[PDB]
Structure 1
Amino acid sequence: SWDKDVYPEPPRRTPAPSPQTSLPNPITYLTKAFDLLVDRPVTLVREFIERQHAKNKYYYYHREFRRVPDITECHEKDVLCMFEAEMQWKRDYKVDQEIVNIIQERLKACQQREGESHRQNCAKELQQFTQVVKAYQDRYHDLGAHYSARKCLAKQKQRMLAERKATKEAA
């Protein structure tokens, strides 16, 4: 029961079976029989386990993290503020990681769904993919083993300056 609009399931568009010729029923004997043999004998068990779970509920919460001044309001040293800033930077980072995972999976499921149509109906999702992965590519990409904030803020300084010269040559 995952959140739907995060992970699109397009219209199912199932075709209507047409026998079109009178012959035996090779799989359907066994799709019905399977749905007799392996459907209910499991279903009873899953349902029983359901009620067993439901007689005593639990509640577990997705944690939250509040915000902080991050890197800006910290002085050049005196770590006591910095620690918060840069570690939560690391959190938000991993968050972005999993965003990249999500998009990257949407693309895969997209091609698998389309079939032979590979370049038809994945254009939108591949497009936003190049958008996001170009963002990540621009921001976090090349720093190194040891990275905290100072280096991300650093690279952002680098781009802002390179684009400020680029926009003086824009004249």
Structure 2
Amino acid sequence: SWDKDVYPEPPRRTPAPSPQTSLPNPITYLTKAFDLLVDRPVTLVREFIERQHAKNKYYYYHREFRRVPDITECHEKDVLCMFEAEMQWKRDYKVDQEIVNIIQERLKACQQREGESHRQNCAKELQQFTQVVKAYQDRYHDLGAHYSARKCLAKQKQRMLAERKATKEAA
């Protein structure tokens, strides 16, 4: 099972079957055969395996990283503090990449699920994708194969200088 808030999904609404004709549809008979011959033995085997798994129980944990000071409060050419800040920045870079992956998966799921009316019913997913892609592009794009926290700090400083000049010339 997963968390239904990070991966949302609307409630399923299926119509009732109305046999207008008198011809028996083979799909109901095939579903009966599938439940008799396939679903029952697989369910029994999984029950046995889960019983074997419940005899001994051990846990694995999600690794927690405490926050260290970032590169903005590191002295220049101070390898210890800069090393810790660089490792933290790389971890957040990986997490941001997977956040963009999550939003992309949401968008693809909406496009497949809504059917032919996807252009109207997937407006919110498109807006979320556009916003998160704009944030990712403003944060991490055009850094090169040798990206580091200093490059990202320089890019953010240049963008902030451009924004300050733009708001000065528009004042």
Given the two structures, how large is their TM-score scaled by the length of structure 1?
Answer: 0.98
Distance across 2 between alignment mates of 1:73 and 1:157? 15
Q: How many residues align?
A: 171
Kindly state the Cα deviation for residue 143 of structure 1 after the two structures are TM-superposed.
0.5
Which residue number corresponds to residue 122 of structure 2? 122
* Alignment TM-score, normalising by the size of structure 2: 0.98
Report how far residue 21 of structure 1 moved.
1.4
CA RMSD of the aligned region, Å? 0.8
1:114 and 1:120 in contact (8 A); partners too: no
Paired residue for 1:21? 21
* SS of 2:119 mapped into structure 1: coil
Runs of 4+ in 1 over 3 A off after TM superposition: none
* Structure number with higher helix proportion: 2
Deviation at 1:15, TM superposition (A): 0.9
Mapped partners of 1:115, 1:89: distance in 2: 40
Aligned-pair distance for 1:25? 2.7
Q: Deviations over 1:30-88 (max 9, x none)?
A: 11011100010111001110010011001100000000111121101121111000111
Q: 1:131 aligned to 2:122?
A: no
Structure 2 unpaired stretches of 5+: none
Q: Percent of counterpart pairs with the same letter?
A: 100
- TM-fit CA distance, 1:113: 0.3
Note the alpha carbon deviations across 1:103-137, whole angstroms, 9 max, x for none.
00100000100000121211011101100000001
Higher deviation after alignment, 22-31 or 157-166: 22-31
Instruction: Give, in whole Å, the separation in 1 of the partners of 2:90 and 2:25.
Output: 59
Unmatched 5+ stretches in structure 1: none
